Design a binder for this molecule. Structure first.
Ligand SMILES: CCCCCCCCCCCCCCCCCC(=O)OC[C@H](COP(=O)([O-])OCC(O)COP(=O)([O-])OC[C@@H](COC(=O)CCCCCCCCCCCCCCCCC)OC(=O)CCCCCCCCCCCCCCCCC)OC(=O)CCCCCCCCCCCCCCCCC
Ligand SMILES: CCCCCCCCCCCCCCCCCC(=O)OC[C@H](COP(=O)([O-])OCC(O)COP(=O)([O-])OC[C@@H](COC(=O)CCCCCCCCCCCCCCCCC)OC(=O)CCCCCCCCCCCCCCCCC)OC(=O)CCCCCCCCCCCCCCCCC
Ligand SMILES: CCCCCCCCCCCCCCCCC[C@@H](O)O[C@H](CO[C@H](O)CCCCCCCCCCCCCCC)COP(=O)(O)OCC[N+](C)(C)C
Ligand SMILES: CCCCCCCCCCCCCCCCC[C@@H](O)O[C@H](CO[C@H](O)CCCCCCCCCCCCCCC)COP(=O)(O)OCC[N+](C)(C)C
Ligand SMILES: CCCCCCCC/C=C\CCCCCCCC(=O)O[C@H](COC(=O)CCCCCCC/C=C/CCCCCCCC)COP(=O)(O)OCCN
Ligand SMILES: *OP(=O)(O)OCC(C)(C)[C@@H](O)C(=O)NCCC(=O)NCCSC(=O)CCCCCCCCCCC
Lengths: 40, 178, 459, 88, 56, 70, 107
């Protein structure tokens, strides 16, 4: 009796570095939120 | 229909079911009453000649040849009572059966007719409302762990109690509502 | 033609400046008034057309489609009133805005006198439908459904645009009157074959043609009720209208280019009909029946005879009304039961008798019982096909039988038998639903009295 | 139709009438509560025949699972009453 | 009550005003195409004593 | 015999009300239409065909027979 | 595993509301009885009384712009004339050959 809306599991497919992950890309990580890399 | 079924039929039940089926089909073959009486007495004599036998193996060898002989001569058009599952009026009145809950959706101008009926109906509703809360716990404690083993239900054991799951059996529509 | 277009545009500010509790009333009243105004287009001539201006013209092929389009809007509003109760005022106004924009685009598309203008509005009809499907649809499949409904369509219509501009660089005009009066034969050539395919495939994919029909069940089962109504009643007929218009420049290539599609239709109508025999969803069954009827319309248009065109017009109108009614009945069951599975709610004739009468009349009309206009169109198409080839009767005959079967199947599973015991929330039918069914079914039986109105320009 | 509304007394009277025409059981010994195997010394085949005579008398069939556990005239009357919805 | 029900029902004039404006718009278009009025070979006619144009 | 029993059935109020309302509105507009058509037929209509008198050019609505169509 | 087995904070699915419960004579248009009654009235009046009856009557009495009876009269006059003068009713040629210039083949 309720319209379906996206949930966390549905929202997680767009959270990767790219769409359609592969073996080569599997180790890629999204950029930081503020787009800053620690100086190390 | 009313009785809960078991896990299997014993040998005696199978024999009795064959006896009833064979007598019914013999009656369907022998239309006249005196002929049926004669051949039914003959079939009874044929049936109990092995009544006293003791071993299971041959007693099961019988009732197998008996089923084969019945299926060979089973009268492909046997007599069926009109209300029986194969009869000419099996589900004839099924379209006139209306559930009780439909009366809850009547207009107040409709319920204004028949005030006594609806007062009694309200009494029944409140009785059901209390009895249900009692029945749930009664069934919860009376059930073996792991779930029911047979779909048979217990009676009421206290004084003011009602048999669990009674509403939809007591409030059957009718056999011939209209 | 602006006497119809301007009030339809004025529907938008009227909707947006309305009170929060008066949107449905005002929209319904003014849509009914616009339908009454559009009724005057039915006065057609045996001569050329009603050429109002350089931009818009009306024909006895366009007039019934315009009347159906204007009549469908109040029914869609009534059908949408129920399930949109708990929605905010702004979103309800947006829904009504989408419906109005769809009606405006359809109105203009039918009356456009230019092929390019027709293409632009024919594509503009996509955006409101896509928004309606993917925003107010219920299940999660709607998104996928929308994608299908989009790309199929575009995959057919991008070549057409190319062909269109090519034609205008060769003939010098895309005006339909000039195109008709200056028609020239198409020689048998590979370039001409591909031009034919480009001009035909966009309209084939929206009928839909068998084998290109996969988008339709998805879109129709995933759409809200108003979306299903407009998709089945009007948007399918855009391909038929386009093919009727564009076949004038495709001769005599159609004499042999039509063979692959004709087969795909004549066999296809069998398959889809048989598919209706084994279906567990009501909306899916109704959509597949729509596919079968539109296959018959495709055959009629490809045969290219006067009786074929008359039958195709009549069948388009009749199917629009009938499929809209069937979708409304299925939705009135769904809003009570929330399942959309045929065998869940059973024996409903005992609980809802008048709705059972509506079900019977809708099933009889879909079954093409004479003298309904459904049967008029079907019989004219069948006679034209018999003249085309006497063997066709076999396939046609088979379809008829199968159709009746599944129609009555749908009537027997849901209405007859014993009621489901545990379903105790089936309330009496509202006046709104009964009025919706009556307003669907009375125009059909009225139209059977004056069939010349829906027989097209070749009457 | 025009079928008279049979009552519990009519059902009991007809059941006893059919049982008294069964020459295997003595009409003096039997009563409404007289058991079949123990009180009257009958067999299982005799019980099947009694059920069949009841079915022929009342025009409807009793399923075997229910019929196999009807061991008194009183329970036969109760079964027929419950099946046919008899008030009094 | 006038000047109060207006603030709620002024909306009901929009569609009829649109209809009248659309009719007026249609009339304007007709004037532009009068290039062959009373000039067709089929309906070529001599004017009446108090007639300026055959149609409007 | 006072063996009258209650018949359980769904409500007929809403179906009956809808039918009454639909009949009322249809008749409300259609009875005056039928009366007007009858009066026009009895007292006015059915023009008869005639030749066009020479020098006279008829109006476009003078080529039709029924008064309502005219 | 001390997780709550709750994926997020979400409202429960509400139960559907019966329009007849709070308002018998509900007509199924709106939860407000007055707005509902007037929606019923306007729908019935503008759908059945106005469009369905008056529009049907208008369509029934549409004037003969398709010119069926005109064609009947013309055909009657032509048949009368041709039977009177012995002409063979319809002619096989739609255009008289005197105005067609065929191309000489000279093959
Ligand atoms: C036949 C002559 C009739 C003359 C009298 C006037 C007839 C008026 C008909 C009006 C149009 C149909 C209306 C449909 C909506 C009904 C609304 C409703 O709920 O009513 C409930 C109302 C109150 O009942 P209730 O107590 O609420 O019912 C409770 C349950 O719902 C229980 O309800 P139920 O079980 O009573 O269900 C209703 C009933 C009846 O309901 C219906 O079925 C309605 C639809 C039937 C036709 C379905 C489409 C078929 C194609 C028709 C195309 C032609 C249209 C003609 C113009 C129509 C203009 C509107 O169901 C049926 O009986 C099955 C009908 C099967 C008909 C098969 C034959 C059809 C073709 C006949 C030949 C026609 C042309 C002949 C040409 C040659 C000679 C001139 O009962 C009725 O009004 C029933 C009316 C009687 C049926 C009329 C059937 C004949 C008329 C057909 C169309 C008009 C023909 C005109 C020329 C006649 C010569
Ligand atoms: C669901 C429902 C949804 C409905 C939706 C809306 C409906 C849409 C329909 C629109 C259609 C309107 C239309 O076009 O009108 C049709 C049509 C109009 O005709 P018209 O082209 O305008 O006039 C023709 C001439 O130009 C002029 O003819 P005339 O001047 O010679 O005739 C005189 C005049 C009057 O004639 C007379 O006064 C006398 C003639 C008969 C009298 C015979 C002698 C009796 C007197 C003798 C006794 C008293 C005097 C002596 C006393 C002493 C006795 C010893 O005749 C009339 O006025 C005809 C009256 C019919 C008007 C019906 C209007 C329809 C309204 C649309 C809405 C309907 C809503 C439903 C409610 C309506 C009310 C129920 O009217 C009829 O067709 C009437 C029926 C006639 C049929 C006769 C029997 C046929 C049966 C044969 C087959 C049998 C086998 C089966
Ligand atoms: C998938 C769901 C259905 C989608 C819709 C399907 C409908 C589209 C079908 C296309 C219609 C037919 C296209 C061409 C028909 C012309 C007739 C021709 O093909 O037949 C012979 C042609 O012979 C051979 O066919 C030559 C072409 C062979 C190569 C074409 C591929 C064959 C099968 C490909 C099907 C793939 C379709 C799907 C694409 C993704 C005739 O011999 P010829 O007299 O010499 O040529 C006459 C034409 N002239 C005059 C211009 C010269
Ligand atoms: C329910 C219980 C019964 C109660 C009712 C009893 C009475 C029964 C009568 C009902 C039907 C019986 C048939 C009687 C037919 C008589 C009327 C008929 O003759 O009129 C027809 C006329 O019918 C109309 O033309 C057809 C109706 C118009 C349909 C348009 C629909 C309205 C708009 C709705 C929206 C559109 C949606 C669909 C878009 C395509 C044909 O007339 P026609 O001989 O030719 O010429 C008329 C007279 N002339 C010569 C002066 C011109
Ligand atoms: C639902 C999916 C359907 C997808 C669309 C299917 C239809 C495809 C139709 C062909 C696509 C291109 C149409 C061309 C536009 C018409 C213009 C035209 O006809 O001009 C021709 C040009 O014709 C072409 O060039 C067409 C060549 C094809 C190239 C594109 C191939 C696309 C795929 C072809 C096979 C598939 C077609 C049928 C698909 C069936 C449905 C799946 C003549 O060119 P000129 O050189 O100026 O004149 C010759 C004398 N000098
Ligand atoms: O005391 P009850 O509980 O009634 O027990 C009855 C009985 C003892 C006879 C029986 O239940 C039982 O347990 N018997 C033990 C052995 C046994 O029965 N072995 C099987 C014998 S089979 C038989 O009876 C032969 C059948 C012959 C009839 C064939 C039917 C063909 C008819 C064709 C259509 C007209």
């Amino acid at each position: 009796a309720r319209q379906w809306q996206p949930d966390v599991e549905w929202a997680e497919q767009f959270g990767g570095a790219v769409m359609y992950p592969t073996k080569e890309t599997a180790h890629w990580k999204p950029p930081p939120w503020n787009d800053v890399d620690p100086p190390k | 229909a009313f009785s809960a079924p078991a896990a299997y039929l014993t040998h005696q039940q199978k024999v009795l079911r064959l006896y009833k089926r064979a007598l019914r089909h013999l009656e369907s073959w022998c239309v006249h009453r005196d002929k049926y009486r004669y051949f039914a007495c003959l079939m009874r004599a044929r049936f109990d000649e092995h009544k006293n036998e003791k071993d299971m193996v041959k007693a099961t060898q019988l009732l197998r040849q008996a089923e084969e002989e019945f299926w060979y001569g089973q009268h492909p058009q046997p007599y069926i009572f009109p209300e029986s599952p194969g009869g000419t009026s099996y589900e004839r009145y099924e379209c006139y059966k209306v559930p009780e809950w439909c009366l809850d959706d009547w207009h107040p101008s409709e319920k204004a007719m028949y005030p006594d009926y609806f007062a009694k109906r309200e009494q029944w509703k409140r009785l059901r409302r209390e009895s249900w809360e009692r029945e749930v716990k009664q069934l919860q404690e009376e059930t073996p762990p792991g779930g029911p083993r047979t779909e048979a239900l217990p009676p009421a054991r206290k004084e003011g109690d009602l048999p669990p799951l009674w509403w939809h059996i007591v409030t059957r529509p009718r056999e011939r509502p209209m | 033609m602006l006497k119809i277009i301007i009030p339809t545009t004025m529907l938008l500010p009227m909707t947006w400046m309305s009170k929060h509790n008066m949107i449905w009333i005002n929209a319904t009243v003014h849509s009914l008034l616009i339908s009454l105004i559009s009724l005057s287009l039915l006065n057609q001539l045996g001569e050329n057309s009603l050429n109002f201006s350089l931009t818009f013209f009306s024909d006895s092929l366009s007039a019934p489609l315009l009347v159906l389009t204007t009549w469908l809007l109040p029914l869609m509003l009534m059908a949408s009133q129920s399930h949109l109760s708990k929605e905010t005022t702004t979103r309800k106004k947006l829904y009504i805005t989408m419906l109005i924009l769809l009606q405006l685009f359809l109105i203009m598309t039918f009356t456009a006198t230019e092929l390019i203008l027709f293409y632009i509005l024919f594509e503009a009809t996509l955006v409101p439908t896509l928004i309606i499907i993917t925003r107010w649809g219920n299940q999660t499949e709607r998104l996928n459904a929308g994608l299908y409904f989009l790309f199929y369509t575009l995959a057919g219509s991008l070549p057409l645009l190319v062909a269109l501009v090519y034609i205008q660089n060769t003939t010098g005009s895309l005006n339909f009157l000039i195109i008709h009066y200056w028609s020239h034969p198409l020689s048998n050539s590979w370039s001409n074959i591909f031009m034919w395919l480009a001009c035909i495939m966009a309209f084939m994919v929206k009928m839909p043609l068998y084998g290109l029909h996969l988008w339709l069940p998805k879109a129709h089962v995933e759409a809200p009720i108003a979306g299903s109504m407009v998709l089945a009643a009007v948007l399918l007929k855009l391909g038929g209208y386009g093919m009727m218009r564009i076949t004038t420049i495709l001769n005599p290539l159609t004499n042999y280019m039509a063979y692959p599609f004709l087969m795909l239709s004549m066999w296809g109508m069998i398959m889809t009909s048989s598919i209706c025999l084994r279906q567990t969803d009501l909306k899916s069954l109704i959509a597949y029946s729509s596919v079968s009827h539109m296959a018959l319309v495709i055959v009629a248009i490809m045969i290219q005879t006067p009786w074929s065109f008359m039958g195709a017009t009549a069948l388009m109108i009749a199917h629009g009304l009938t499929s809209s009614m069937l979708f409304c009945l299925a939705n009135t069951n769904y809003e009570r039961v929330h399942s959309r599975t045929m065998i869940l709610a059973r024996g409903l004739q005992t609980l809802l008798p008048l709705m059972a009468t509506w079900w019977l009349v809708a099933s009889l009309t879909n079954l093409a019982l004479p003298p309904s206009i459904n049967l008029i169109g079907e019989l004219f198409i069948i006679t034209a096909s018999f003249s085309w080839s006497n063997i066709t009767i076999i396939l046609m005959g088979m379809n008829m039988m199968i159709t009746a079967l599944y129609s009555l199947y749908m009537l027997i599973t849901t209405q007859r038998g014993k009621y489901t015991h545990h379903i105790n929330n089936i309330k009496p039918s509202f006046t709104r639903e009964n009025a919706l069914m009556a307003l669907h079914i009375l125009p059909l039986l009225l139209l059977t009295l004056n069939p010349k109105m829906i027989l097209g320009p070749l009457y | 139709s025009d079928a008279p509304p049979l009552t519990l007394e009519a059902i009991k009277d007809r059941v006893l009438y059919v049982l008294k025409l069964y020459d295997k059981i003595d009409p003096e010994k039997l009563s409404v509560n007289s058991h079949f195997m123990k009180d009257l010394g009958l067999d299982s085949l005799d019980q099947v025949e009694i059920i069949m005579a009841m079915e022929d008398e009342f025009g409807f069939e009793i399923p075997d699972i229910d019929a196999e556990k009807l061991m008194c005239p009183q329970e036969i009357v109760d079964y027929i009453a419950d099946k046919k919805d008899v008030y009094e | 009550n006038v000047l109060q029900i207006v603030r709620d029902h002024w909306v009901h004039i929009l569609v009829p005003v649109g209809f009248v404006f659309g009719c007026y718009l249609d009339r304007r278009s007709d004037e532009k195409l009068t290039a062959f009025r009373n000039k067709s070979l089929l309906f070529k006619r001599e004017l009446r004593p108090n007639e300026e144009v055959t149609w409007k | 015999h006072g063996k009258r029993l209650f018949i359980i059935k769904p409500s007929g109020f809403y179906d009956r009300r809808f039918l009454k309302l639909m009949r009322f509105y249809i008749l409300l507009t259609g009875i005056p239409v039928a009366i007007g058509i009858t009066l026009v037929n009895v007292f006015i209509g059915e023009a008869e065909l005639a030749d066009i008198p020479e020098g006279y050019v008829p109006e476009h609505w003078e080529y039709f027979k029924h008064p309502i169509s005219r | 595993p001390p997780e709550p087995t709750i994926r997020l904070q979400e409202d429960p699915d509400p139960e559907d509301e019966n329009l007849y419960e709070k308002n018998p004579d509900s007509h199924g248009y709106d939860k407000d009885p007055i707005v509902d009654l007037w929606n019923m009235r306007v729908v019935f009046f503008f759908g059945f009384s106005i469009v369905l009856v008056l529009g049907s009557t208008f369509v029934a009495y549409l004037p003969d712009y398709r010119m069926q009876e005109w064609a009947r009269r013309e055909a009657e006059r032509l048949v009368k004339y041709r039977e009177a003068n012995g002409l063979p009713l319809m002619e096989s040629n739609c255009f008289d050959p005197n105005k067609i210039q065929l191309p000489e083949d000279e093959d």
